[PDB]
Enzyme design. Structure first.
Site, PDB file in Angstrom:
ATOM      1  N   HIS A   1      -4.421  -4.491  -2.540  1.00 20.73           N
ATOM      2  CA  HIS A   1      -4.794  -4.189  -1.166  1.00 20.73           C
ATOM      3  C   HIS A   1      -4.956  -2.695  -0.919  1.00 20.73           C
ATOM      4  O   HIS A   1      -4.910  -2.255   0.233  1.00 20.73           O
ATOM      5  CB  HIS A   1      -3.768  -4.781  -0.201  1.00 20.73           C
ATOM      6  CG  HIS A   1      -3.925  -6.253   0.010  1.00 20.73           C
ATOM      7  ND1 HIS A   1      -4.960  -6.976  -0.540  1.00 20.73           N
ATOM      8  CD2 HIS A   1      -3.178  -7.139   0.707  1.00 20.73           C
ATOM      9  CE1 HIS A   1      -4.845  -8.244  -0.190  1.00 20.73           C
ATOM     10  NE2 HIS A   1      -3.772  -8.369   0.568  1.00 20.73           N
TER      11      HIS A   1
ATOM     12  N   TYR B   1       0.807  -1.209   0.000  1.00 16.21           N
ATOM     13  CA  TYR B   1       0.000   0.000   0.000  1.00 16.21           C
ATOM     14  C   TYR B   1       0.844   1.265   0.000  1.00 16.21           C
ATOM     15  O   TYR B   1       0.298   2.364   0.136  1.00 16.21           O
ATOM     16  CB  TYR B   1      -0.945  -0.009   1.197  1.00 16.21           C
ATOM     17  CG  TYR B   1      -0.439  -0.840   2.347  1.00 16.21           C
ATOM     18  CD1 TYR B   1      -1.035  -2.048   2.661  1.00 16.21           C
ATOM     19  CD2 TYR B   1       0.612  -0.401   3.138  1.00 16.21           C
ATOM     20  CE1 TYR B   1      -0.578  -2.812   3.704  1.00 16.21           C
ATOM     21  CE2 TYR B   1       1.070  -1.156   4.194  1.00 16.21           C
ATOM     22  CZ  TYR B   1       0.469  -2.360   4.476  1.00 16.21           C
ATOM     23  OH  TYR B   1       0.919  -3.122   5.527  1.00 16.21           O
ATOM     24  N   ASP B   2       2.156   1.132  -0.135  1.00 17.24           N
ATOM     25  CA  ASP B   2       3.048   2.269  -0.272  1.00 17.24           C
ATOM     26  C   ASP B   2       3.166   2.676  -1.736  1.00 17.24           C
ATOM     27  O   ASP B   2       2.690   1.989  -2.643  1.00 17.24           O
ATOM     28  CB  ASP B   2       4.422   1.935   0.301  1.00 17.24           C
ATOM     29  CG  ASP B   2       4.888   0.548  -0.081  1.00 17.24           C
ATOM     30  OD1 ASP B   2       4.544  -0.413   0.635  1.00 17.24           O
ATOM     31  OD2 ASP B   2       5.597   0.418  -1.100  1.00 17.24           O
TER      32      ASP B   2
END
Lengths: 324, 310, 271, 268
Positions: free
Chosen positions: B146, B109-110
Site C-alpha cells: 500500500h 505505510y509506516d
C-alpha cells in the site's frame, strides 16, 4: 574455429553503438546473476524438434483429408479436439513428440550465459537436459502445482506446459481453447512469469517479433508505469535484416532488439549461424575476447579491483577468485 | 496445545528454517506501537467536511470525499500533520525478524518495520513504489503493498482513499504481481489482521481463483480479544486459511493486545529449536527423517554424523 | 430550487416521451412492511452463534450460513421469511402512474409484478438468465437480483457474498440489459441510499463511461436528515442528480411513506 | 435449412429480426476493402507490398511511426468515394430487420435506408447511444466517418480492437443486448473472422439455452466441410451455406448472396 573467432572480433569491432550497449547490459546482468532467458520455439527447432506446423498438418489431414494463417495454428488443433476426441489428440501428440532430440549448441550457449531463470514456451525437455548436463539445477515448473513446491531458487518455467506428466493435450497449451483460458487455468504460472520479467533482465531468443507470446507480453508491458520496468532484449534471428520502421515500432513498445541478420551476413536457411552470432558475441564479451586497447584493460581490472579498495589487504589466494 | 495448532507451529518453524517463511504484517502490529490508526484520519476528514463525527466502506469513502472536495493539497496537509510522527518499534517487530522471514509483505505505510529491520541488522529491499520492483537491490523484499511516505507524506504515494483501492490493480501491477508470486512461492503468516480486513478477503478471493491444491494455505495469527467462533473458523479455514488464535492459546484482558500477539510470536520463536518429540514413535520418525537420505550411501563416516544431527 | 424544478421538468419530459425507466430499491418494498434483509441476517446470525452489522457482515453472515450450515437450511429460512403476501404501498401505484418504459428493481419480491397486474400495464418480467431471450413484451420488469418465482431458493437470488462476487459471470445477460437500459433511457432511483452497494457500483460503471456520453440518472433521497451539501456535490460530480425529499419538506424521523409520496405526487402533479 | 428459414421468417414477422452485416456486402458494393488499405500503409511504410494480425499491426505501425495526420490522409484518399448500394442491401432491408448491426464504417446501409424510406437511428459513437431518438437502431459497432475521415472515429488498427471495450462500452453493451434479445443473422462474414470469433467467445460465457443461436450466412465459393460446419454448430452458430444451395462460380459472390437473400425474402 580461429577464422570464426577472428570474424566475431571484426564484427564486434564495427558493431553499432546501440548493439554494443545492449551486449554490455546483457553481460552485466549475467555477471550480476539477474539475467533470465526467454527461449522460444526457434531454439528447439535448431535441434530439429517437431515444429507445430507439422502437427497442424496432421490435424488437417485427419480432419479434411488434405493439407495456415495465425488463427489456424490454434483453431485446427481445436477443430480436432472438438470434432474428434481428446484421446486422438493425445495420440497424435504422443506419436509426434515422444522423440529424444539432442541439445543444440545454442542451448549450451544459453546455459553458459548463467541465466538466473529460463522461461520458455517450449513443451520439450531440451532445456532441462541442457541444464542437467552443465551441473546447475533448475526447478522445472510446467504445471500449476509445481509453483508452490519449487525446490530451488532457479526456475525453468515452461509457461505452456510440457509432457513430463504425459503426452496429453491437457498438460500443454496448444489449441485455441487453451490460449483463450490461459489466464484462468495458469494464474500461478503467468504471475511467476510476470514477476520474473519485472525483477530480472529478460532476453528473448528463438522468437519472432510477431509471435503471439511476444505480442501478449508487450500488451502486458503497456499496462506498467512508464520507466518502472527494464526493456527486455530481443534477439532477432530472421534471415532478412529488420526494417527501420519495424525496429523503431518495436523498440517504442519496450524492446531492445539485437538483429542477427544486421550484425553478420549469413544464408537464408542458416538459422543456427544467426543464433550463434549473437550468443557468441555475448559469450566472448563475457570471456573478454573483444578487449584490445590499454584503456579497456584498465577499466576491466579496475572494475574487478576497485571494490577491494574498501579492504586493507587482500590475500593472493583471494585474487584468484577476484579474476574468476 | 491443540494438535492442529502444533501442526501449524511445526509448519511455520520448518518454513522458517528453510528460508521460505514470509510474514504478512497488518495495521495491528503498527497500532501496538501507537502509530496513528486510520479511524482518526477519517474522523478528521469528517470534521473538515461536516460539522462533527463508521462503516467499512466509509473508512475509504470519507477520505475520498475529502479529496474530491477539499483538494489534494488539503488531503496532503492532513496526512502530513497526522502521520509525521516518530514511534518506537514493538518487540513483535523484533520477534518477526527473529523468525528470519524470507520476505515481509505489509499493508503498513509506516517505517516501523523498516526501523526494526535497520536496528536488528536485516537488509531488505524496500519496495513501496512501482519503480522499486525493478530497482530492488536484493532477492529479499520488504514489500509495502500500500505504499509508504518515504518519497513524501503525499496521498499519491499510498493507498488510502476509496479511489486508491478501486484502481490498485491498475496503479500497482508490479507490486500486486510480486505479492501474489511471493504468496504462491512461500509460506505466508498473517499477523496484525482482523480476519475481516479488506486485504485479507481480497487475498482469499484471489486464492479462490487458484487451482484446488496448487497453493499452500496461508497461516493467520488471530489476536482478537475473544476466541474465534467455531463456525467462523470452519468458514475461514475452508477458504484457504490456517488460523492460530491468540485468545484460545492464552487468557488475557480485552485491551491487552500486546500479550496476545507476544504469546503466539514467542511460542513460534521458542519452537524453532523444539523438535516436538514425546513418544518413541516421534523419536523414530525424527531419526528416520534424519537418516533415510543416507540409505543411498553405502557408508557414512561417524565423524560426519554430527552434521546430520546438527 | 431552480435545480430541483429543472429536475422534475426533465423527468416529466422523459415520462411524456416514453423514455423513462424506474430503478427500484429496498426502501419501496420496506414501505409495505416487507421482510427486510437485516432481520434475515439476524436470523442467520442467531442460527450460527445463538446471539444476534457492518456493510461486509450483511453479505458475509448469509455466506457463512450457506457454507457451514448448507443450502437446505438457507432455502428453508428464505422460504419461512419471504413466503408472505404484502399489500402494495401507494408508492408502487405512483411509480406506475408515471408511465415508466422499464422497471429495473433489485428487490426479489413480486410487489412490482402485482402492482403492474392491477394497473393493467403488462411488463415482461425478466429475473433469470433464460428470461432475457424469451421476452414477450418490449417493456421489461428487470429484477437484476432475481426473485422467488421459480422457488424460495438462494440460487435464484443475489443475496450472499458469493452471489455479489460472481454476479457478472452468473448474470451477464441481465447486467448487459440493465446497463443498456440505463444508457438509452432516463433512470430515476427510489428506495436506495447514497451509500448503497449497487448505487456505488453503478457509479463506478458510469465513471468507466466516456464523459458526457450518458444522461445523469436521478437519485431520490428519503433519508431523514437533509443531504449534506458536501455529500450532495460529491455524488453529483459522480454522475447523479439528487432530489432530496428531506430538503423538500419537513417530516418526522420515521415517516418514510410521506417522504416518498412527496416526490412521487409532485412528479405526478407536474405531469 | 428449411427449419432455419422458418425461424428467420417467423422472427421477421414478429419484428425482432436483426442482421449483422459484414465487409462482404460492402465488397459486393465495390467498397474499398481493408486489404488494399493495409497494402497502401505497407507501401508508405516499407516501400514494397497477409497475416491475420498484419491487417491490424501494419496500420498500427504506420500510425505509430508516421503519425495521425498521414494515417487520416490515407484514410480520406482511400475511403472518400461514392459507391452505389448493391441489391443485397435492398434485400436485407426488405427482410424488415428490427436493428442492423454493422462492422462497416461506410454509409452504404445508411444510403440504402434513406433510399427505401426506413428510419434507423444510426449509432457509431458513444454519444449516439444516449441521444438515439428511434426504437430502430443502425449500430455501427466499429464507428464510421460521419464525423470525419479520422482514424479515431473508427476501429481499424490494433490498439483499437485491443481497447475496444474501454473506448466503446456503451456500443458494445448495446450490441450484446440486441444480440441477446433478438435473433441474429450474420451476412458478409467469414467463419474465421475476428469479430465472429469475439462474439462466439462472448457467447461461450453465457449459460446454455439462455441465448438464441445466431444465424450465419456463408458465401464462400467452396461448400463447407462437415467437420468445420459441426464445430461451428457446437460453438453456437446455425450455418446456412450459399455454396451448398446452388452451383456458383468462384468469383461470383453476388449470386451466392442472392441465393440466400431472395430465398429468405420469398419465404415470407
Amino acid at each position: 574455429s580461429k577464422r570464426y573467432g577472428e570474424k566475431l572480433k571484426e564484427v564486434f569491432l564495427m558493431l553499432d553503438n546501440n548493439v554494443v550497449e545492449c551486449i554490455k547490459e546483457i553481460t552485466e546482468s549475467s555477471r550480476n546473476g539477474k539475467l533470465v532467458f526467454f527461449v522460444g520455439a526457434g531454439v528447439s527447432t535448431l535441434s530439429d524438434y517437431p515444429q507445430w506446423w507439422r502437427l497442424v498438418d496432421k490435424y488437417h489431414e485427419e480432419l479434411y483429408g488434405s493439407p495456415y494463417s495465425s488463427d489456424e495454428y490454434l483453431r485446427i488443433p481445436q477443430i480436432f479436439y472438438n470434432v474428434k476426441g481428446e484421446m486422438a489428440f493425445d495420440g497424435i501428440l504422443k506419436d509426434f513428440f515422444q522423440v529424444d532430440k539432442p541439445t543444440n549448441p545454442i542451448h549450451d550457449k544459453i546455459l553458459a550465459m548463467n541465466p538466473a531463470h529460463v522461461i520458455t514456451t517450449n513443451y520439450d525437455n531440451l532445456i532441462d537436459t541442457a541444464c542437467w548436463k552443465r551441473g546447475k539445477y533448475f526447478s522445472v515448473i510446467s504445471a500449476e502445482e509445481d509453483v508452490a513446491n519449487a525446490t530451488s531458487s532457479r526456475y525453468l518455467l515452461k509457461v505452456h506446459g510440457d509432457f513430463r506428466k504425459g503426452f496429453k493435450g491437457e498438460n500443454v497449451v496448444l489449441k485455441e481453447d487453451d490460449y483463450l483460458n490461459y489466464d484462468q487455468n495458469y494464474p500461478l504460472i503467468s504471475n511467476l512469469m510476470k514477476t520474473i520479467i519485472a525483477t530480472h533482465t529478460i532476453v528473448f531468443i528463438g522468437y519472432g517479433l510477431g509471435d503471439y507470446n511476444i505480442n501478449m507480453l508487450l500488451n502486458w508491458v503497456r499496462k506498467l508505469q512508464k520507466d518502472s520496468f527494464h526493456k527486455p532484449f530481443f534477439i532477432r534471428t530472421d534471415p532478412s535484416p529488420i526494417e527501420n520502421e519495424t525496429l523503431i515500432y518495436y523498440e517504442n513498445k519496450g524492446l531492445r532488439i539485437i538483429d542477427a541478420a544486421s550484425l553478420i551476413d549469413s544464408n537464408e536457411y542458416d538459422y543456427l549461424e544467426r543464433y550463434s552470432a549473437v550468443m557468441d558475441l555475448l559469450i566472448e564479451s563475457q570471456e573478454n575476447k573483444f578487449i584490445t586497447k590499454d584503456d579497456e584493460v584498465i577499466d576491466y581490472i579496475y572494475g574487478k579491483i576497485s571494490p577491494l579498495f574498501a579492504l586493507q589487504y587482500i590475500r593472493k589466494i583471494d585474487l584468484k577468485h577476484v579474476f574468476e
